[PDB]
């Protein structure tokens, strides 16, 4: 009986898991519906499965008073007002682990593609003009490089594991230090944010988007980079000031920027750019992907399953395993 709205397309097997417990109102197409259309569907929904284009604020919740649970098919719930969910007695749940590994893979791929001029290399061969080896496309590889992680959580760790054996010197700065056991095991040295940006050949971002991280990578910080340094962003766009990244690119201090994420995606920002600057889109020392960190079908299936288990738990009157927040529940 309880209505559940699902804002984007999910695997058949997921609908089968839910269909006995809920009234599914699904978006089994390839499109992102309108803000006003999801509001209408959610108006008396007991439940919601949310995805990356979703944004949930106190305004949204006011118009949807039957909501008991919002199940997020994602890790970074920055576009979801958790306090306001709590104020309305709505569970919010996320997916803590399943997005990690394929995002870590993409990022290393970006680091390699960016450092080796893959976009133009490939464009060149595709132009038909290839005739053999030339003294051209000399790049930056991982061997002997200083690699710097900003952040050292799930993707931080999964990337460092993936770079064991690459002959790089690994260093990091994070809100919380890793125990000495993990540092020695992964070859990781802890350094300050300033030192990270001044010494690293590659700088890989692995931070969530919050108030302390908004525009953390800025002109002051980019002004510090060794000339030609490569910056890689698989996490959230507004951890970076995209305009200062452009400027470091044009002056040739920053060697390259790769990103899977963009400022324009951060819906909880009133003042978000409405687009990626065409000038960064067209800069040659770049490589981009459309938020496909977790775009592997087998993985997406499990992300959906995790979200569905959470939603179903919540509707069964239990505390969901991946609740980010806390509601009153009866004791023994």
Q: Is 261 in the site for ligand NAD (CB under 6 A)?
A: yes
Q: Which stretch binds ligand NAD (CB under 6 A): 43-51, 57-65, 83-91, 167-175?
A: 167-175
Applying the rule CB under 6 A, the residues between 124 and 153 that interact with ligand NAD are: 151-153
Applying the rule CB under 8 A, the residues between 150 and 169 that interact with a second copy are: 161-167
Q: Is 264 in the site for a second copy (CB under 8 A)?
A: yes
Instruction: Report the relative pairing of strands 3-6 and 47-50 from DSSP bridges.
Output: parallel
Applying the rule CB under 6 A, the residues between 264 and 323 that interact with ligand NAD are: 291, 293-294
Residue written as token pair 């700065």: 173
Report in angstroms how near the CB of residue 106 gets to a second copy at its nearest. Answer: 6
- Cα-based distances in Å from 286 to 205, 221, 298: 15, 19, 29
**Per rule CB under 6 A, count of chain residues that contact ligand NAD:** 29
Structure tokens at 279: 């000038």
Applying the rule CB under 8 A, the residues between 95 and 154 that interact with a second copy are: 101-102, 105-106, 108-109, 112-113, 116-119, 121-122, 124-126, 128, 130-144
Calpha distance 58→70 (Å, rounded) = 13
Residue written as token pair 């306090």: 83
Q: Is 298 in the site for a second copy (CB under 8 A)?
A: yes
Task: Determine which one of 68, 173, 236, 305 is catalytic.
Answer: 236
Which are the contacts of 309, defined by CB distance < 8 A and separation ≥ 6? Answer: 320, 321
DSSP state of 127: T
Radius of gyration from C-alpha coordinates of the chain: 22
DSSP state of 217: B
Note if 68 is an active site residue. Answer: no
Residue 120, phi then psi, degrees to nearest 5: -85, -40
One DSSP character per residue, 242-303 reads: HHHHHHHHHTTSEEEEEES--GGG-TT-TT--SS--HHHHH-SSEEE-SS-TT--HHHHHHH
228: left (phi over 0), alpha (psi -120 to 50) or beta: left
Out of 40, 275, 318, 321, name the contact with a second copy by CB under 8 A. 275
Note if 43 is an active site residue. Answer: no
39 contact, one of a second copy, ligand NAD, none, CB 5-8 Å limit per kind: none
Residue 222, phi then psi, degrees to nearest 5: -75, -35
Applying the rule CB under 8 A, the residues between 166 and 225 that interact with a second copy are: 166-167
Note if 55 is an active site residue. Answer: no
CA-nearest of 168, 165, 189, 169 to 178 is 189
User: Residues of 93-112 as b/e, b for ≥16 C-beta within 10 angstroms?
Assistant: bbbeebbbbbbbbbbbbbbb
Residue 2 or 289: which CB sits closer to ligand NAD?
A: 289
Calpha distance 187→170 (Å, rounded) = 6
88 contact, one of a second copy, ligand NAD, none, CB 5-8 Å limit per kind: none
In the shown chain, the binding pattern of residues 42 to 71 toward a second copy, with x for contact by CB under 8 A and - for none, equals ---------xxx------------------
Task: Determine which one of 265, 300, 304, 305 is catalytic.
Answer: 265
Q: Is 53 in the site for ligand NAD (CB under 6 A)?
A: no
Residues that bind a second copy (CB under 8 A): 8-10, 30-32, 51-53, 101-102, 105-106, 108-109, 112-113, 116-119, 121-122, 124-126, 128, 130-144, 161-167, 262, 264-265, 275-276, 278, 281-282, 287-292, 295-300
Residues that bind ligand NAD (CB under 6 A): 75-76, 99-100, 103, 151-156, 173-176, 206-209, 212-213, 234-236, 260-261, 291, 293-294
Q: Which residues are catalytic?
A: 236, 265, 291
């Amino acid at each position: 009986l309880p209505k559940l709205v699902i804002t984007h397309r999910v695997h058949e097997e997921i609908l089968q898991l839910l269909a006995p417990h809920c009234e599914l109102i699904t978006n089994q197409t390839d499109s992102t519906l309108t803000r006003e259309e999801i509001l209408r569907r959610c108006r008396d929904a007991q439940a919601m499965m949310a995805f990356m284009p979703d944004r949930v604020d106190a305004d949204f919740l006011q118009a949807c008073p039957e909501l008991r649970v919002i199940g997020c098919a994602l890790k970074g719930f920055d576009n979801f007002d958790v306090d306001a969910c709590t104020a309305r007695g709505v569970w919010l749940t996320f997916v803590p682990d399943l997005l990690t590994v394929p995002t870590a893979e993409l990022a290393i791929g970006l680091a390699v593609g960016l450092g080796r001029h893959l976009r133009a290399a490939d464009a060149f061969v595709r132009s038909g003009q290839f005739r053999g080896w030339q003294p051209r496309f000399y790049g930056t590889g991982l061997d002997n490089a200083t690699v710097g992680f900003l952040g050292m959580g799930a993707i931080g760790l999964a990337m460092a594991d993936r770079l064991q054996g690459w002959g790089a010197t690994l260093q990091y700065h994070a809100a919380k230090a890793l125990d000495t056991q993990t540092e020695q095991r992964l070859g990781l040295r802890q350094v300050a944010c300033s030192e990270l940006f001044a010494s690293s050949d590659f700088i890989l971002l692995a931070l969530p988007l919050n108030a302390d991280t908004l525009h953390l990578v800025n002109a002051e910080l980019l002004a510090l980079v060794r000339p030609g340094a490569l910056l890689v962003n698989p996490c959230r766009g507004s951890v970076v000031d995209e305009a200062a990244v452009l400027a470091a690119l044009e002056r040739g201090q920053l060697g390259g920027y790769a990103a899977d994420v963009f400022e324009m995606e951060d819906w909880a920002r009133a003042d978000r750019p409405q687009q990626i600057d065409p000038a960064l889109l067209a800069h040659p020392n770049t490589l981009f992907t459309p938020h496909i960190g977790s775009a592997v079908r087998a993985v997406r299936l499990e992300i959906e399953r995790c979200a569905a288990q959470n939603i179903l738990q919540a509707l069964a009157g239990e505390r969901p395993i991946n609740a980010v927040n806390r509601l009153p529940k009866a004791n023994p």
